[PDB]
Ligand binder design. Structure first.
Ligand SMILES: COc1ccc(/N=C/c2c(O)ccc3c2oc2cc(Cl)c(O)c(Cl)c23)cc1
Length: 329
């Protein structure tokens, strides 16, 4: 009775071999800077958990980004800080430069390196086939790094990938939903943005792992090579799974939930239907064919699999022939 357990197939026990303080973020003691070192310039955005500003370090005229955390969840605050410090210096991980106490909100304000980002809505319309492969490889470097450090991002999406296209620089940002992977642990399924939620989240399977990020990455790849953003455009979390099933088919979906002894929410009875798997060539047309190759479709197919245990890992993905044409380092 109940779901079948699952474990990551890589980096499974990295945290249990760590000192407790590495992953015990509740015990972390924050070292504070001087908030008056930074002057806010303009607000860049606001979400449920933070407000983000362009700012200047007034001690050396340096551009920085300041993320003022909202006082909603406090252990979520220590979690993000500890993860950012643990991952600092890793390939294409945003660098946390300082932590100050904002005088107005009385909450932590995170100071990050600045990236000359262009909005993905404008940038993805300009990317060549080579650019897509290049930036995909850069994202994979960041994902393999954090996974190898025992951390899943859980909010991979174009909005959380800052790209300075003039300088071909990429940073993975917003670690507010990131979590330490502990084998056998049941996690909250209310993570990631709707269009990038893995099937495991949508069927309410809690014992997921780093492979969630690889589904989200596959969703990004599909939107880039097919020029369709987002690729799976659900109107809610239930319709999101139906949209996936209209592409991947319902037979493999039922095989997936049967393998883990998962029972679908009965509200899917009236909306899921019966769908064959579609060949990826259905989504190729004159406006995206220059972005599609046999290698791209083979890669995408190995990311967008219902069974989280069957997806390519970040390291395996970097070995894929899709990246043979990319000059590295
Ligand atoms: C011209 O319009 C723009 C130019 C740059 C621009 N840069 C945002 C930016 C950054 O350069 C580094 C880190 C973050 C940024 O936004 C974030 C949000 C969250 Cl939530 C977060 O955790 C992090 Cl680390 C960052 C945003 C708009």
């Amino acid at each position: 009775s109940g779901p079948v357990p699952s474990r990551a197939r890589v980096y499974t026990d990295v945290n249990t071999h760590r000192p407790r303080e590495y992953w015990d973020y509740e015990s972390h003691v924050v070292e504070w800077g001087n908030q008056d070192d930074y002057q806010l310039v303009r607000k860049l955005g606001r979400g449920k958990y933070s407000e983000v500003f362009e700012a200047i370090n007034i001690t050396n005229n340096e551009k920085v980004v300041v993320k003022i955390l909202k006082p909603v969840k406090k252990k979520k605050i220590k979690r993000e800080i500890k993860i950012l410090e643990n991952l600092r210096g890793g390939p294409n991980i945003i660098t946390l430069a300082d932590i100050v106490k904002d005088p107005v909100s009385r909450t932590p304000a995170l100071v990050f390196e600045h990236v000359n980002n262009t909005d993905f809505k404008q940038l993805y319309q300009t990317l060549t086939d080579y650019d897509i492969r290049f930036y995909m490889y850069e994202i994979l470097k960041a994902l393999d790094y954090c996974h190898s450090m025992g951390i899943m991002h859980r909010d991979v999406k174009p909005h959380n990938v800052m790209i300075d296209h003039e300088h071909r620089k990429l940073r993975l940002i917003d670690w507010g939903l990131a979590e330490f992977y502990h084998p056998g642990q049941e996690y909250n399924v209310r993570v990631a943005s709707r269009y990038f939620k893995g099937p495991e989240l949508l069927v309410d399977y809690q014992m997921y792992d780093y492979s969630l990020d690889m589904w989200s990455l596959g969703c990004m790849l599909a939107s880039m090579i097919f020029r369709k953003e987002p690729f799976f455009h659900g109107h809610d979390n239930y319709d999101q799974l139906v949209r996936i099933a209209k592409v991947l088919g319902t037979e493999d979906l039922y095989d997936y939930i049967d393998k883990y002894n998962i029972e679908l929410d009965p509200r899917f009875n009236d909306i899921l239907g019966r769908h064959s798997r579609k060949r990826w060539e259905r989504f190729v047309h004159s406006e995206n064919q220059h972005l599609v190759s046999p290698e791209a479709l083979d890669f995408l197919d190995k990311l967008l699999r219902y069974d989280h245990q069957s997806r390519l890992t970040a390291r395996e993905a970097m070995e894929h022939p899709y990246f043979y044409t990319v000059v590295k380092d």
